[PDB]
Design a protein around this ligand. Structure first.
Ligand SMILES: COc1cc2c(Nc3ccc(NC(=O)c4ccccc4)cc3)ncnc2cc1O
Ligand SMILES: COc1cc2c(Nc3ccc(NC(=O)c4ccccc4)cc3)ncnc2cc1O
Ligand SMILES: COc1cc2c(Nc3ccc(NC(=O)c4ccccc4)cc3)ncnc2cc1O
Lengths: 450, 450, 450
C-alpha cells in the first residue's frame, strides 16, 4: 500500500544562535531537512507534508524546488497537534511515517523495517536502547506488545531501569491517524498534545503496537546546537568513508576525509589525507588524489594523478592527465587525455587538447588550446579594458614562449612558435614564428650599491 | 580578602629533551607557565610569586614583561621548601593559592570554588577522583573532614581503594603558610619537605581542611614530555572548539580546528576543516573560512569569504571582500569593502580601495591602490637595485594591464589605463593611456623541431 | 642458533576489490609484506621463504629486489600445507618463525621474546588475550603448558570462556617442522591442513609448547579489506608519532601527522598539523615545519623554518634557510645556508648559493645561482623550442630585476645588474648593467569605458 511522510521542521533552533531556521543547517553540505525529504522519497513517499513555521521565508527560498506540501504551524502545541495540521491530507488507506527535520540521519533501511513491522490498523513504533535512558520516554511492554510510553517524571523505580526508549518515529495508516489525533488531549505540565498518546489509544481499540529498534542511536538524535550538529557530521562522514573503504576505495585516513554530495568511483582509487569531495564527482580507475585537494562537481578519467593542494570545480579531466601540485581548475576547464597542468596555474572556461602542457605560473581563461602545445611559464591570456571577455584560440602543436601575453580576441594557428616575452595582439598564422625584438642598454663597469 | 599566587616553575623537564626549560613549552601557542600566570591574574591575584631555576636565563627573556616576583630556587628539596622561598613575601591576611607551571589547564572557575571553600584559618585542598588512583596520594577523610594525604607506598589495603587523590593545589592564608611551612620536615626516602604535610599540621591546630573536586582531571595533569603535552593541547583545543560551537560558530570538524590566541566572532560564522587561528582575530557576521586557511592577527568584516589555502597575517579585510584560494596577505595588508584578491597573489604593506580586484599571479607591496581598480594578472610592484623599498601610488578607477611592472617610487593618477607588458617608471597622469610599442620579427614557414 | 622465516603471502584479497594482490597494499607507503620481510631481516633471518600465488607477476615486479626464496603455491590447502612447500629448504638445526604477509605490524621485539621462549625441540606459540574471543582458536593449557588449540565450533561452554587465543605465529626448529608437517591431516569441514595441529603433535612427542603473549593485538591483526587496512595505518602512525614525541619532537597533533619512511631529527624540532614526511628525511636542530607541508627525501639543516603549504622532494636545504609559504622544491633543488625561497616559487634541479633570495612568483630550473643574489619577482628560466633543457649560470652578487626571462644556455657573471622586464639571451659580464629600453605610446585624455 501507499506511503506518505510528515516531517516536523517548524523549530527556531534558538541555541544555534543563527538567523537560519533550525533545519536549514547542513550535514555534508545538505540542509538537515533535505536529508529527511530525500530519505522519505527513497522510501517511495507519495506526499511529503512539511510542517514549517520559524524562518518560513527562508525555508521557502532554500527548499523552493522540493516536492513537499507546505503546512504552516502558527503555534507550538506538541507533536500530535503539528501532525494533525497535515492529517486532513492523509489518505485513509495509505501508511504515514512521522519524521523530524532536525534528526537528519534516519535511514531508508531502518524505516523499511519499521513499515514492514506495522500490523494492520496498528502502529509501528521506532525505539532504541540506551545505557543511560534518563530523560527519555520508557517503552512499556506487556507480554511482547508495546502498551505505553512512560515519561521520565512519571516512571517508577522499576520503569526507570527500562533501557528501551521512544524515538518519536512511528508508522500508522491515515484513517487511524485522523481518528486517534482527534482523541489526544493536552492536560499536562506543558499543555501540549503529545504523539506518544497514540500508543495508548491504539491498545484501547484492541489494535497492536509493534516496536522496531534503530540500528544506531545517531539515526534518531536531533541537533539542537552546532556542537551536536558537528557530532552528527562526523558520524555521517565516518559512515560514508567506511562504505567507500569497503567498496575498495583506498582512503588513507577516513577521519580526514569529507564527502559532501555523491562519489562514483572505479577500482584502485587512492585518496590521501584532507581531501574534500563536493557535489557530483566521478573518478575513473586508478585515480590518485594527493593531500589537501578539493574536487567539486568534476569528472576525472582513468589513471589521473592529482597532486597536493589542487582545487578543481565544474571541470573535466581526461585519462592519464597530471594535475598539480597547487593547480586551480575553475568552472568550464576541460583537459583532454595526457595533459599536464602544474604549480601556480589557473585554468578557467578553457579546453586544453591532448598531450598539451601548462606547467608554471600561468593563467588561461576563455581559451581553446589544441593538442601537443607547450604553454610556457608566466603565460597570461588577457583582454582589452572595456566590455566582455573574448576568446583566445590556439591550434595544435603550438609553442608559446614564457611570459607571453595573449591578448584576446586572437588566434594562433597550427605549428606556430612564439618567443618569450612577446605580446600577441594580432593573429598568428600556421607555422609562423614570432619573436620579440628587444632594445637593451648595456653599461660596463657598473658597481652595484653593495 | 586579598589573594596572591605561588607558581612552581623550576623544573628542568629532562624528558622533553629540549634546550628550553619545562614550563616554556607551549599550549595553544602560549607557554605553559603563561597559562597559569594569566589564570592567577584572572582570579585577581595581587602578587604572583614565580619559583624558577632551570633555564633561568631563558625564563627571564621569554617572560620579561610578566608581573611576577622572581624567586630563584637553587636546589630541589620538595614543594614545601619551594613555596617557603616565597613565604617571606606573603601577607599574613591574604589568601595564597599554590599552582604548578607545568599544569597549564587549571581554570579560574575551579580555583574560585576552591578559594570559597577555604574555612577561616584553614586550608582548601583541590582533589580529584581517579578510576585507577595507583601512585597518587590518597585523601583520608574522618567524618567529612580531610585529615591526611596518604602516599601510595604508605597506604594500607583499605586506603588503596580510595579513589579521591591529591592534586597538589591548595589555598591557605599567609600567616598559616609561614607557620606550617616552618614545621615541615624532610625525614623521608627522598629527603624532601612535602607540602602535603600541611594537611596534618592544620588538623593538629584544630584548623579545618576542606576538599574541593576538580571538574576535569586534565586541569591538574602536568606535562612531563611532548606526548603528554600533545594530549593537553588536544584537550584544550577541543574545549575551545566546543565553547565556540555552543556560541554558534559553525566549525565543520572541531578535531581539525586550532585556536592559538583569541577569537571574537559574529553570528553565522562558518569555519571549514584544518583552519588555524592565531593571535588576536576578529571575524564579523557571516564570515566563511575555507579549508586550510591560516589567520594570524586579523580583522575580517561582515560577509567576507576566505577561500581555501589562504594565509593572512596582521591584515584588515573590509565587508563583502573575497579572498582566495591561494591568497597571501602579509603584514600591513588593508583591503577595503567589496575587494577581490585571487589565486597566487601576494599583498604586503598595501592599501587596496573599495571594489578593486587583484585576481591572479601578482605581487603588490608598499602600495596604495584606490577604488575600483583592475590590477591584471602578472602585475608586479618592484624597486630599483639599492636601498629602501619605496611606494607605488595608484589612484581610483585605474586599469593596469597584465604583466605590468610598476617600478617605485611612482604614481598613477585617477582613470589611467596601462596596456599589458608595460614597464612603468615615470608618473602617469589622470586619464593617461600608456601602451607599450613592441617590435616583433615575423618569420613565415618556420617548421618546428617536432 | 640460526633463524629463517616463512611468510604466507599467496591470498587474493578479494574484499580489497583491487587488481593488486592482498599483501602489496601499503601501510606507511610500504607494502604490507615488505613490513614483514624487513622485520624478519631485523631478527637476523638467514633465509626468508615467501609463499606467494595470486598476483604472482605483480609480486615479482614489486618485490624484485627482496632477498626472499620464491615458493609458489598453486592451491589453498591450509597453513600447514603452505608452510610445507617451504619445508624442504629448512635446515634441521635452525629455528623457523612463521609469519603472515597481511599482518604487517608484528614487531621484532615481540618475536625476540617468542624465539627466546621456545624450548629445545619444542614450539613457541604467539598468543593474545581478547575480551570477546568469539571465533578464534582458544588456547588450552594443562598445568601451565599449552596442550591444544580448540576452534570456536569445537569448544565447550567452559572453553568458550577462555580469553587467550591463537595468533598463528609460532617458532620451532626445522627438523621438527619437517616431521610434524608430514603428520598433519585434512579430515575437517574445510579439507585443509592446519598448522594449529603442530601443538598437539608436539605434546604427543613429549615436546613442550610454550606460549608468549603479544604486546598489542594490532601486531597480529590481518587486513582483509581497506577499512581494516586504514585501522592498521592509523595505529601504526600513532605509534610512530608517539615514539617521536617521547624522543622530544614537538608534533602539535599526532593524529594529524604522517611518516611514510624514516625520519632522523635533532633537538627542539617543531612539526605543525597536517605534515607528511615521506622516504628518507633528515631534520637538523630547531627545524620548524609549518602546517600542510610535504617533505619527501630531503635533508634540512639546523634552524630552518619551512612555512605552510610547501612541497619539497629530493632536495637539500642549508642551515638558517627560510622556505615558504607556498614554495615548491622539485628534485635536485639545493639551497645553501641563509637562503630565502618565497610564495609561488618553483625551484627544480638548481643550486642556490648562500644568502640568495627568490621570494615571489618565480621558476628557476637547471640553474646555478651564486651567493647573495636577488632574484626578483616573476623571473623565469626558460629554453628555446627544440631539444634538451640547458643551463642558466648566475654568479655571486647578481641583481635580476622582476619579470626577467633568462633564456638558457646563458651566463650572468659576478656583480651584474639586470633591469626589470628584460629578456636575457646573451651572456652578461662581470659588473655589467643591462636595462631594457622600452618604447611607449602616451595618449592624454583617454576616457576609460566606465
Ligand atoms: C525541527 O522542528 C521540530 C522538531 C521536533 C522534534 N525534533 C526532535 C528530533 C529528534 C529527537 N530525538 C530524540 O527524541 C531521541 C534522541 C536519542 C534517543 C532517543 C530519542 C528529539 C526531537 N521533536 C519534536 N517536535 C518537533 C517539532 C518541530 O517543529
Ligand atoms: C615545573 O616546575 C615544577 C613542577 C612541580 C610539580 N609539577 C606537577 C604538576 C602537576 C602534577 N599533577 C599531579 O600530581 C596530578 C595529576 C593528575 C591527577 C592528580 C594529580 C604533578 C606535578 N609538582 C611538584 N613540584 C614541582 C616543582 C617544580 O619546580
Ligand atoms: C596473505 O596470504 C595469506 C594470509 C594468510 C593468513 N593471514 C592472516 C593473518 C593474520 C590473522 N590474524 C589472526 O588470526 C588474529 C587476529 C587477531 C587476534 C588473533 C588472531 C589471520 C590471518 N592466515 C592464514 N593463512 C594465510 C595464507 C595466506 O596465503
Amino acid at each position: 500500500k501507499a506511503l506518505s511522510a510528515v516531517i516536523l521542521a517548524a523549530g527556531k533552533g534558538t541555541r544555534m544562535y543563527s538567523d537560519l531556521p533550525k533545519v536549514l543547517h547542513t550535514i555534508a553540505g545538505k540542509p538537515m531537512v533535505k536529508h529527511v525529504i530525500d530519505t522519505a522519497h527513497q522510501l517511495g513517499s507519495e506526499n511529503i507534508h512539511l510542517i514549517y513555521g520559524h524562518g518560513g521565508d527562508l525555508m521557502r527560498t532554500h527548499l523552493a524546488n522540493e516536492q513537499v506540501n507546505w503546512v504552516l504551524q502558527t503555534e507550538q502545541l506538541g507533536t500530535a497537534h503539528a501532525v494533525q495540521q497535515a492529517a486532513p491530507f492523509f489518505k485513509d488507506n495509505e501508511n504515514i511515517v512521522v519524521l523530524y527535520g532536525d534528526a537528519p540521519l534516519i535511514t531508508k533501511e531502518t524505516l523499511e523495517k519499521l513499515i514492514e513491522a506495522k500490523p494492520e490498523n496498528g502502529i509501528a513504533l521506532l525505539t532504541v536502547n540506551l545505557d543511560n535512558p534518563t530523560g527519555y520516554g520508557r517503552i512499556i511492554r506487556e507480554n511482547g506488545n508495546v502498551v505505553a510510553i512512560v515519561e521520565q517524571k512519571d516512571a517508577n523505580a522499576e520503569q526507570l531501569n527500562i533501557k528501551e526508549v521512544n524515538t518519536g518515529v512511528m508508522v500508522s495508516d491515515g484513517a487511524s491517524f485522523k481518528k486517534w489525533l482527534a482523541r489526544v488531549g493536552n492536560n499536562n505540565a506543558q499543555g501540549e498534545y503529545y504523539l506518544t498518546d497514540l500508543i495508548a489509544l491504539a491498545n484501547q481499540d484492541n489494535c497492536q503496537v509493534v516496536a522496531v529498534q534503530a540500528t544506531d542511536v545517531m539515526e534518531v538524535e536531533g541537533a539542537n546546537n552546532r556542537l551536536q550538529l558537528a557530532a552528527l557530521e562526523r558520524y555521517f562522514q565516518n559512515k560514508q568513508a567506511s562504505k567507500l573503504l569497503l567498496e575498495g576505495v583506498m582512503i588513507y585516513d577516513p577521519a580526514r576525509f569529507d564527502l559532501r554530495g555523491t562519489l562514483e568511483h572505479g577500482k584502485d582509487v587512492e585518496i590521501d589525507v584532507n581531501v574534500i569531495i563536493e557535489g557530483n564527482v566521478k573518478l575513473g580507475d586508478r585515480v590518485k588524489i594527493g593531500t589537501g585537494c578539493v574536487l567539486k562537481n568534476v569528472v576525472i578519467g582513468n589513471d589521473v594523478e592529482i597532486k597536493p593542494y589542487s582545487v578543481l570545480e565544474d571541470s573535466i579531466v581526461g585519462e592519464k592527465a597530471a594535475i598539480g601540485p597547487f593547480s586551480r581548475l575553475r568552472p568550464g576547464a576541460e583537459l583532454a587525455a595526457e595533459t599536464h597542468v602544474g604549480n601556480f596555474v589557473e585554468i578557467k572556461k578553457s579546453t586544453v587538447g591532448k598531450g598539451s602542457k601548462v606547467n608554471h605560473l600561468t593563467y588561461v581563461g576563455d581559451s581553446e588550446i589544441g593538442s601537443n602545445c607547450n604553454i610556457g611559464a608566466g603565460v597570461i591570456t588577457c583582454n582589452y579594458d572595456g566590455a566582455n571577455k573574448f576568446k583566445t584560440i590556439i591550434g595544435d602543436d603550438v609553442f608559446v614562449g614564457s611570459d607571453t601575453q595573449l591578448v584576446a580576441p586572437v588566434k594562433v594557428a597550427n605549428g606556430a612558435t612564439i618567443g618569450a616575452g612577446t605580446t600577441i595582439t594580432r593573429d598568428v598564422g600556421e607555422n609562423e614564428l614570432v619573436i620579440t625584438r628587444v632594445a637593451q642598454r648595456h653599461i660596463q663597469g657598473w658597481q652595484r650599491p653593495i
